[PDB]
């Protein structure tokens, strides 16, 4: 499942990701952009035994449990596979824990490398939210 720029923003907004820990609705859609490019089944593997999953590209080492990663914490306490659904709740719900975690959104490399400050509102342009 591959969300729409705004089709997303809307589901992201509903989940209340706006002004989240000072993160505007734009900070998110920008990350989900550069990360999975809005794909809910996106997976990428690393050179540490870990795999990032779904739209926000949560990572098995700390966040979810995929049964094969070393030094697994499962902070979001969920099977990573749930992170692959079309229902961005797993994902959105899990990102919320990542933030609490005092680096903020710096955790999203593609965020923190493609939309630091910048004009994240870009992504909401015309997004009637």
């Amino acid at each position, epitope marked *: 499942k591959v969300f729409g720029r705004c089709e997303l923003a809307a589901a992201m907004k509903r989940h209340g990701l706006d002004n989240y820990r000072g993160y505007s609705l734009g900070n998110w859609v920008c990350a989900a952009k550069f990360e999975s490019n809005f794909n809910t*089944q996106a*997976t990428n*593997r*690393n*050179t*540490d*035994g870990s795999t990032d999953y779904g739209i926000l590209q949560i990572n098995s080492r700390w966040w979810c449990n*995929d*049964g*094969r*990663t*070393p030094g697994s914490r499962n902070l979001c306490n969920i*099977p990573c*596979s749930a992170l*692959l659904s079309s229902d961005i709740t797993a994902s959105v719900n899990c990102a919320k824990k990542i933030v609490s975690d005092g680096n903020g959104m710096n955790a999203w490399v593609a965020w923190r490398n493609r939309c630091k400050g910048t004009d994240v509102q870009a992504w909401i342009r015309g997004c009637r939210l």
Partner: antibody, heavy 116, light 108 residues
Framework: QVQLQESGAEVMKPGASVKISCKATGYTFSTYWIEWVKQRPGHGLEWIGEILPGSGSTYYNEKFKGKATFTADTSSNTAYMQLSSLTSEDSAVYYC?????????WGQGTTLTVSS | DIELTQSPATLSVTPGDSVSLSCRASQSISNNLHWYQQKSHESPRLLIKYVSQSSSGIPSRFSGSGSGTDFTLSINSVETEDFGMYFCQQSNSWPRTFGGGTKLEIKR
């Protein structure tokens, strides 16, 4: 007990295809990845790829991408692998294994022979 | 891919002797290597995981250690039942890679 049961020997013409199945019992089947491995007599093992059954997600070793094709029936608890356009070089034993980092649980193997 | 190269290809050992198998990774796979044993016909069988953790049921005779690019499985006192093929696999990256196997035959 966690078990993986695979299909029996296959003897095929060159150019046809085959579909090796991997029925897996004893665990939340949507949770772990199924990885496939190939063992040709004279080579070591060779990783073909993996499927996370039910998610739509698969990854191929660049070599096999285009010739292996993983699907899965969450209903039945079977993951399948299709290999098409069979050449002599396809004749081997294939295995499904549940993706644990290590592979602690393997299937019994399936022997494929390709010949005219 | 990360190429693991095994040595020796073959090894003839008298039962009761000790042996070391070598697995060297083309690049640091950190602590992400497992060893399997395979008797003729059957699926491989995990002996060691993440370089050195015992999988229950495996005879204490089998132990592993190492790190970086060099791993070793040691079989202290080989029985007649330890003879088959022996592979190391990495789970660091994808594709997963297996070494070429060390074939352990009985000396007589």
């Amino acid at each position: 007990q966690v078990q993986l049961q695979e299909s029996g020997a296959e003897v095929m013409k060159p150019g046809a295809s085959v579909k090796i199945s991997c029925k897996a019992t004893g665990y939340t089947f949507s949770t772990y990845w199924i990885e496939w491995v190939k063992q040709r007599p004279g080579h070591g093992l060779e990783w073909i790829g993996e499927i996370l059954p039910g998610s739509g997600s698969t990854y191929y070793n660049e070599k096999f991408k285009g010739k292996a094709t993983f699907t899965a029936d969450t209903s039945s608890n079977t993951a399948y692998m299709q290999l098409s356009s069979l050449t002599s070089e396809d004749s081997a034993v294939y295995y499904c294994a549940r993706g644990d980092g290590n592979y602690g649980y393997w299937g019994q193997g399936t022997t494929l022979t390709v010949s005219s | 891919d990360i190429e693991l190269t095994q040595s020796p290809a073959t090894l003839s050992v008298t039962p009761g002797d000790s042996v070391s198998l070598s697995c060297r990774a083309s690049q640091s796979i950190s602590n992400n290597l497992h060893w399997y044993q395979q008797k003729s016909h059957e699926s491989p069988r995990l002996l060691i995981k993440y370089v050195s953790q015992s999988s229950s049921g495996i005879p204490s005779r089998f132990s592993g250690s190492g790190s970086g690019t060099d791993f070793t499985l040691s079989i202290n006192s080989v029985e007649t039942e330890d003879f088959g093929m022996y592979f190391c696999q990495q789970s660091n990256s994808w594709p997963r890679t297996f070494g070429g196997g060390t074939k352990l035959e009985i000396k007589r």
